[PDB]
Amino acid sequence: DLPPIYCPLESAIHPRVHEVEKRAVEWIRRSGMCASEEERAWVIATHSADFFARFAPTAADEDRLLATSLWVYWGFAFDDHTRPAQFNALAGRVQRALEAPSAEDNGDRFVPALQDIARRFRSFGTPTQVRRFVHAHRAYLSGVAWQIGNQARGHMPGLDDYLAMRLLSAGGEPTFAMLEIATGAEVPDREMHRPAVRALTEMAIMVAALDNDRHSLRDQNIYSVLMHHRGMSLQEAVEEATKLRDRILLRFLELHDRVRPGAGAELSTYLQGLRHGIRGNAEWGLRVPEDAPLTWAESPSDSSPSPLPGAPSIAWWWDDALLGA
Amino acid sequence: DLPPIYCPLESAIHPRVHEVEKRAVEWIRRSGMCASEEERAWVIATHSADFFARFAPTAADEDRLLATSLWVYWGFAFDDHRCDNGPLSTRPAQFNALAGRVQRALEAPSAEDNGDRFVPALQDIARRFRSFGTPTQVRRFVHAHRAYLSGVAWQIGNQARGHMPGLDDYLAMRLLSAGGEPTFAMLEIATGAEVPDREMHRPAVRALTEMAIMVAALDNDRHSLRHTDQNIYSVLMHHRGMSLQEAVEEATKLRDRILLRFLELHDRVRPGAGAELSTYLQGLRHGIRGNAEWGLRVPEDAPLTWAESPSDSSPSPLPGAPSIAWWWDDALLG
């Protein structure tokens, strides 16, 4: 019993989505990241071009939209897999290959593909935009390492730890750090790293992450964490999860409205990218198994302007004294 | 049987080191990082203020040299109690969770410690870094910090499996696990010189940072030689069937080659550098030298000897380490 999603945000998709999808399907087939035709079909069936065309709907350069979409395909293909000890090494190697073009594949299937993506990013993006994506990619790999860690030990994390980890393990950091690369609109340091923008970025990531949890009811996820800790039933957890998520999005809209008016063209595009991304991520979740009409919740299920109790690690999102920008 | 260190770089130490060491000893006592009197005295005996006062010897504000110095103390304590000998040293699953929690505590001032002694200490250091560094410098430190932790996770993974990495994985891993990224990312905070994104992130500058880090990491491995530990020596003894004495000569050759390429690239990049990049590059240089000099002095006033010449002066990439070959590629580092 799944309530409709609260997402009063702009929905749009690149007009050239289908041309990019074609080129991306080509690159998947040639990438070497897939053993069998059955594995390609699985990665092709993620419709990651359709996903990311919703994040950068007006990207001037079709090739930047392709490069950024390819990573999303790479991410789905990488996460369809490993013990923590081998993973920590593999995470280290893959991330080195992202940062070091002279790194060699050593027969690892994912490294050439990521290095082809990195080479496309280095031919378009500034060294600054590449370093942002690089750091986001390591943050994601740390999240995955954390989640594989918990599973191998049978640690079910409490809410604060789950939300912190899922911030990273969902792949939201690298996805949102590709907005600039797709658009070409370079956000200056003093704007991109304002705490206020950091909280907007994390809050957009968290809501996309909790919406991915919801699209997965069909084993570390907000529902398990709430059931295991708060002794809730599935329904009671579904209802509590929707309240957490809707409260976070409410904070996002509020902080966004405080921040958007003073913003430069580049930060402004980035912020419309967060919004497009949150909505795109929800809409892609509903439309992926395409053209049927979607139903959306008109109101938050919880309107509280105060921080989530039991999640101190995300409380600073609500602390305007800390975010004076 | 160890040859002297090739290190023809500026030795200098902050004229206020002794005052800063005093306030840092005070902070280590009320820090909470340390269970016993015995640990406190260990942390203190790292002389981390002397170490980092070599990295930023003209720091205008000793509060900034202090804050940065604190992380170096936190660093030794974190390695010694969580990474090298802690029940976590062979438990990557548990270490992966700790690294997530410690990193989150550094990015999120509202995070709670969950009874981990190292977190409130880190959060205090973070609060200082935020009080006078720009949010850009704080993020460069925070990113460098997760990089360091990823390296330790890789190291601890290898220890659990009894896996001795090869030269390529070892140099890539050690680039991170030896804590040089966050060490060097504190130069800006210590000095107040905000290096613009366009300059800091130039591949040439990134390569100098990595080479400054590799060299300091291999001087650390040299410092730790005075079988099963992952270091350049067991790496070479295992993968290339060498005696310890052959590994030692081999390690010295590779390290000196990297230092020469650092020196060559430094000389091509320094002339055009703006004032903030120039300060950062003097830091890399002061750091390399500071790391080695601190390592021969840490039990310290006696005359040291240095190698007048490198052990190998080949101007091309290390054999068997393609992950660093791009440091020699002047086209990619335009």
Residues of A in contact with B147 (CB under 8 A): 138
**Cβ atoms B156, B92 nearer than 8 A:** yes
Query: Is the CB of residue B260 less than 8 Å from the CB of residue B315?
Result: yes
Separation of alpha carbons A170 and A212, rounded Å:
8
For A79: left if phi > 0, alpha if psi spans -120 to 50, otherwise beta; the answer is alpha
Nearest CA in chain B to A148: B93
How is residue A43 written in tokens? 């990665």
H helices of chain B, in order, are 17-29, 37-44, 48-53, 62-78, 92-107, 118-132, 135-161, 167-177, 180-184, 187-191, 197-200, 203-223, 232-239, 244-269, 275-297, 322-325
Residue recorded with tokens 């990495």: B165
φ/ψ of B273, rounded to 5, equals -60, 130
Q: Residue A237: what residue type?
A: A
CA distance B100 to chain A (A): 7
Those residues whose C-beta lies under 8 Å from the C-beta of residue A231, and which sit 6 or more positions away, are none
3-state secondary structure of B6: strand
Which residue of chain B is at minimal alpha-carbon distance from A154? Answer: B93
Closest CA in chain A for residue B172: A96
Count of the separate structural domains present in chain B = 1
Q: After which residues is chain A broken (C to N over 2.5 A)?
A: 81, 218, 289
B310-B313-B316-B321 Cα dihedral, nearest 10 degrees: -40
Breaks in chain B (C to N > 2.5 A) come right after 226, 299
The distance from CA B232 to its chain's CA centroid, rounded to whole angstroms, is: 16
H/E segment holding residue A70:
helix A62-78
Q: Tokens 């052990």 belong to which residue? A: B311
Strand, helix or coil for residue A301: coil
Instruction: For the beta carbon of residue B179, count every other beta carbon within 10 angstroms.
Output: 26
Amino acid (one-letter) located at A100: A
Question: What is the span of the domain harbouring residue B201?
Answer: 1-334
H or E element, residue A106: none
Count, residues in chain B: 334
Residues facing residue A296 across a β-bridge: A5
A80 contacts: CB under 8 Å, gap ≥ 6: A42, A43
Phi, psi (degrees; rounded to nearest 5) at B289: -55, -50
Please say whether the beta carbons of B228 and B238 come within 8 A.
no
Per 3-state DSSP, chain A is made up of helix, strand and coil in percentages (nearest 5) of 65, 0, 30
DSSP-derived secondary structure letter, B307? E
Say how far apart CA A113 and CA A73 lie, in whole Å: 10
| A contact test, residue of B175, B197, B276 with most A CBs within 10 A | B197
Helix/strand/coil (H/E/C) assignment for every residue in A271-293: HHHHHHHHHHHHHHHHHCCCCCC
Residues A313 and A172: their CA atoms lie apart, in Å, by 17
SS (H, E, C) A144-190: HHHHHHHHHHCCCCCHHHHHHHHHHHCCHHHHHCCHHHHHCCCCCHH
Using alpha carbons, select from B54, B51, B66 the residue that is nearest to residue B12: B54
> Which among A130, A139, A157 has the least Cβ separation from residue B146?
A139
Q: Which residues from B are below 8 Å from A97, CB to CB?
A: 323
Q: Return the structure tokens found at A310.
A: 């039991």
> Cα(B334)–Cα(A29) distance, rounded to whole angstroms?
33
Helix H or strand E segment including A202 = helix A195-214
Q: Enter the tokens of residue A285.
A: 């979740």
User: Of the candidates B199, B306, B98, which has an alpha carbon nearest to the alpha carbon of residue A84?
Assistant: B98
Determined by X-ray
Instruction: Using alpha carbons, select from A12, B238, B265 the residue that is nearest to residue B273.
Output: B265
